[PDB]
Design a protein around this nucleic acid. Structure first.
Ligand SMILES: [Mg+2]
Ligand SMILES: [Mg+2]
Ligand SMILES: [Mg+2]
Ligand SMILES: [Mg+2]
Ligand SMILES: [Mg+2]
Ligand SMILES: [Mg+2]
Ligand SMILES: [Mg+2]
Ligand SMILES: [Mg+2]
Ligand SMILES: [Mg+2]
Ligand SMILES: [Mg+2]
Ligand SMILES: [Mg+2]
Ligand SMILES: [Mg+2]
Ligand SMILES: [Mg+2]
Ligand SMILES: [Mg+2]
Ligand SMILES: [Mg+2]
Ligand SMILES: [Mg+2]
Ligand SMILES: [Mg+2]
Ligand SMILES: [Mg+2]
Lengths: 83, 99, 62, 208, 99
RNA sequence: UGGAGAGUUUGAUCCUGGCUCAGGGUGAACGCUGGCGGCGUGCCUAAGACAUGCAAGUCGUGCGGGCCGCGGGGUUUUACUCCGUGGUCAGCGGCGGACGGGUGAGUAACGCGUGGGUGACCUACCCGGAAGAGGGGGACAACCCGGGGAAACUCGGGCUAAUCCCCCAUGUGGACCCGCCCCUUGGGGUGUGUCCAAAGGGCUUUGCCCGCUUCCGGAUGGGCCCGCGUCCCAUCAGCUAGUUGGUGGGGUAAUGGCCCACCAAGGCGACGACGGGUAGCCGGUCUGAGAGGAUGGCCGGCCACAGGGGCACUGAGACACGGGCCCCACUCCUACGGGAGGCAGCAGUUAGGAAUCUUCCGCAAUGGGCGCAAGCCUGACGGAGCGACGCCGCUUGGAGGAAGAAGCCCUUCGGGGUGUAAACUCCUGAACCCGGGACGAAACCCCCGACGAGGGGACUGACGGUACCGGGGUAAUAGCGCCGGCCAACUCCGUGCCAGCAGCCGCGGUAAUACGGAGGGCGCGAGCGUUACCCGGAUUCACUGGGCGUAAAGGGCGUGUAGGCGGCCUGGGGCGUCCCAUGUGAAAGA
């Protein structure tokens, strides 16, 4: 099915992912439907996790599954909290 | 040496017979019906059509046919039955097809 | 055919050779040079200036 | 890179006194004073009038030798200047002069630009508190360029910052001799440097 | 949108098909001059309503044969046998290019 | 924000005009030389042939068995091996093996690109919604038995379980004919007739978790279609029988001559059909002032292929890279009865070649498949290694140091050059050694809450004892090309149309700045040169931006077809054209 997941960018010993929604069957680094966030696991900058929540929610509501690791990061920017 | 895609092969073979059976059955009956419709034998033409319809639909359930495919089979059968009959006819065994 | 550059050489009837390209305005139908210093083409002895053409190892300054 | 090998021998040839040894190339010695002719068996012969090429080659070489920078680094630095906004000549100097090794010399933490290189490279310099050892490092407006706390009292550094009491440091910079700090305020204007170099001919060198 | 093209009927020798010739003009990619090229389209005419000389809108469609992927939309104007004659002269001239 | 020209035809000149060079670039190769690191990148040839290992599995919470280790006592225990659980083994059954990964052979084509179309269609798993999961039967492996085999294993007879198969029911609904209304290519509705469902598993169990069935909608991924764009030869000019169309079938998810009967005689072509040759196409890339020219390795997207060729099966999907059949080619085992095989997956071998790597580490990360989960698998991937192959960065010292040692070169025998270069004094301290030592990793899971939100806890690192930080600490690799002009840099000796140089002009005949060596210089510098190829220069295919009296170039002249171009005025149209908005122009690159 369609997925919310981490596409690897950046470089060697420089992981910088994009949080992206994409058919599960693409290659990891391949074409994707839409970009929503980016993530830098080493927090080399303060704006190291970003997500467009209002879009991630669109995508979650039309049946995209997120990766464990992606979920964690959407949770952290409160895609999941509902007041 | 061994992979157990061998399994998948063993299995494809079983299904291959399963579907062959349903498919050849569907054609013998579909033929039979159009044949009877042409002879003008409408009680048995419709009788058989119904059986054929059933078997086609039964087949749609799993891999054998699906879709627009069964519908199509059905469509052509009753288009072909209803008309051959209509040349003589009266839809005796009122079963099978709309007034 | 192929030119054998350098003062002196060691090529004979079955010597193996690296051909290079480059003609010689002077020998008609010689479109190629032999690469000295490679396969059976020896370097050029005593050569001290343009040493890397002519496949010549840097001489020892004992 | 940085050449390594005889200098106040191109303090000559360029025929014009660069300052590659800082301190001696001020004594009755930079050989510009003694032997103001090119090196070698010739040098003091009839000067044949220079080709348009040689004119520019020399101008280019002059400038480069001043900062002690490899031609690959130089051309790069230059091609960057060209793409950059407005006057390629002026800008290009500013980029040369923005270098760390050179900033350090302009602060007189070091006598010569060679020296500055060696100081930077050996951990003695610090930019905004963290230590840098990349001579090529680009210095930006507003940066504190200091001398490393552990290096603060080294023979050479006290000597060199002793001479900086007295002197004025180029207008585009500030200096704090007591505390050994410096500030790169702005980029050097084309005139702030009295360079023995018509940079317009250097642009023309790279046009071929 | 379905592509609409207009042009003349230069053949109606086929059953329920008219050959419709479409002129078009583009600037030349390099030399800039406006050039005029033309393509013929087999167009479905299910009611053999269109005749030679008819200028017609042609509309993109569900394939009707190999070749036919355009139905005839409507009739812009009628009996332009001048444009037909033009094409046929161009075609007849070929007889004088061989060996 | 952008554009350089020079040498060579003559006694000399102008023009024409070719040849040649300086520049940039590359998956490179070769020569001389080589110190460090980071990030990239490395079979361009034989889409030749391949030893060996690994590259796709996973579910015991679908099902029944074999074997084992235990618990719990059967005769007290080893001989009839009994219950419970935790392992393993195939089998049956699912989901996956259609993705990921490889390669560029074929393809000049709707293959690709770009924009559209589908009232001509499909989409497993995911999401939203509605309604179900009610009855019955049955067989095949496993397993036992036997015949067969050297074995691979292979046949026969018999047992058997399920989420395996089959029938019946309910029909929320759906399919189909026909009629009606709407809509307008087969779209939506509706009536009667006929036809169609399903599967159970686990727990702490009158409640939860995973599955099963039907329909509707969503999302994602696709198929098919069309406009336009897509190389060289016309010394390839005619091509075409399923050929073009129609009718009725067959086929498919679906249109379609896709396939088949029948009918008609069409269809295509100088706006280049057909044929031959070459080629995967694009984002981009290199070059260029640009317009253009060239290219399409790496990374992304699409296509094609999987020893050559055909074929289908299974399936949501394949005509299937590690599935199947047959033919062909080639190889391997063989007890001569027969068997087995497909690296254009990762490594690697071998051959071909100027030339291109480890049979490395790890699933810690990200992603993928299966599973409730734990977790398993993952040569995708993340890393390490090797190679100056490429780019960026860094070092081989720094400051002082003589009107200036020695050596060596020149010398007008006073000098001059190497050269502040060295020696020498201080200074710093690459490497080294010592101590410490990462980020990348917080989830999944566990507990509170409700197995939601939200709060709390635990595990986890290949790279790596690495990066980096702190503390000690040694003056510590330099080479390559060129010095006749273009082109930056000159003297001496040797040589004497020889040896040799050479990109072009041309140098070499005994004073050679052009050969070879020395000293000296210029240019780059862990590199420098060479060869090859592309663009430039080349306004030398000229759109930008050239020409034809004599330099190459006016057709021997009419007539004329297609075509190209078309005076003055007014109106209509608005195709060209221009404007605005808007969609599209993916990401990466710039
Ligand atoms: Mg039969
Ligand atoms: Mg030479
Ligand atoms: Mg002449
Ligand atoms: Mg070597
Ligand atoms: Mg298209
Ligand atoms: Mg049809
Ligand atoms: Mg199919
Ligand atoms: Mg090819
Ligand atoms: Mg140009
Ligand atoms: Mg092969
Ligand atoms: Mg394989
Ligand atoms: Mg070989
Ligand atoms: Mg040109
Ligand atoms: Mg001309
Ligand atoms: Mg003449
Ligand atoms: Mg003439
Ligand atoms: Mg004439
Ligand atoms: Mg005319």
């Amino acid at each position: 099915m369609v997925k919310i997941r981490l596409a690897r960018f950046g470089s060697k010993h420089n992981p910088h992912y994009r949080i992206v929604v994409t058919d599960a069957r693409r290659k990891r680094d391949g074409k994707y439907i839409e970009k929503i966030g980016y993530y830098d696991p080493r927090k080399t900058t303060p704006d190291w996790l970003k997500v467009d929540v209002e879009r991630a929610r669109y995508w979650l509501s039309v049946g995209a599954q997120p990766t464990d690791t992606a979920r964690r990061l959407l949770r952290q920017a409160g895609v999941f909290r509902q007041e | 040496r061994n992979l157990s895609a061998l399994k998948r092969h063993r299995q494809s073979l079983k299904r291959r017979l399963r579907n062959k059976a349903k498919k050849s059955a569907i054609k013998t009956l579909s033929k039979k019906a159009i044949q009877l419709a042409q002879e003008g034998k409408a009680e048995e033409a419709l009788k058989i059509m119904r059986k054929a319809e059933s078997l086609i639909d039964k087949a749609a359930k799993g891999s054998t046919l699906h879709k627009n495919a069964a519908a199509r089979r059905k469509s052509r059968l009753m288009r072909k039955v209803r008309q051959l009959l209509e040349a003589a006819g009266a839809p005796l065994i009122g079963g099978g097809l709309s007034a | 055919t192929a030119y054998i550059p350098g003062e002196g050489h060691n090529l004979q009837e079955h010597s193996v050779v690296l051909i290079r390209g480059g003609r010689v305005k002077d020998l008609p139908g010689v479109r190629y040079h032999i690469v000295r210093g490679v396969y059976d083409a020896a370097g050029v002895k005593d050569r001290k200036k343009s040493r890397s053409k002519y496949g010549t190892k840097k001489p020892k300054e004992a | 890179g940085r050449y390594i090998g005889p200098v106040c021998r191109l303090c000559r040839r360029e025929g014009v006194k660069l300052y590659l040894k800082g301190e001696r190339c001020y004594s009755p010695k930079c050989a510009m004073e003694r032997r103001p002719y090119p090196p070698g068996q010739h040098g003091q012969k009839r000067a044949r009038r220079p080709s348009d090429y040689a004119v520019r080659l020399r101008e280019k070489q002059k400038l480069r030798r001043i900062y002690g920078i490899s031609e690959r680094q130089f051309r790069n630095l230059f091609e960057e200047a060209s793409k950059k906004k407005g006057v390629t000549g002026s800008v290009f100097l500013g980029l040369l002069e923005s270098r760390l090794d050179n900033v350090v010399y302009r602060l007189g933490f070091a006598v010569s630009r060679r020296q500055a290189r060696q100081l930077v490279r050996h951990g003695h310099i610090t930019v905004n508190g963290r230590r840098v050892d990349l001579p090529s490092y680009r210095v930006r407006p507003g940066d504190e360029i200091a001398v490393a706390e552990k290096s603060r009292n080294l023979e050479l550094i006290r000597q060199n910052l002793e001479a900086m009491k007295g002197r004025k440091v180029g207008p585009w910079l500030s200096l704090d001799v007591e505390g050994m700090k410096g500030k790169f305020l702005r980029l050097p204007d084309r005139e702030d440097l009295a360079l023995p170099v018509n940079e317009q001919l250097v642009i023309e060198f790279y046009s071929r | 949108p379905k592509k609409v093209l207009t042009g003349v009927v230069v053949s109606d020798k086929m059953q329920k098909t008219v050959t419709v010739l479409v002129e078009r003009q583009f600037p030349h990619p390099l030399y800039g001059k406006v050039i005029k090229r033309s393509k013929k389209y087999l167009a479905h005419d299910p009611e053999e309503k269109y005749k030679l000389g008819d200028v017609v809108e042609i509309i993109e469609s569900r394939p009707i044969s190999k070749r036919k992927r355009f139905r005839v939309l409507r009739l812009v104007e009628s009996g332009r046998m001048d444009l037909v004659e033009k094409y046929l002269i161009r075609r007849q001239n070929y007889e004088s290019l061989s060996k």
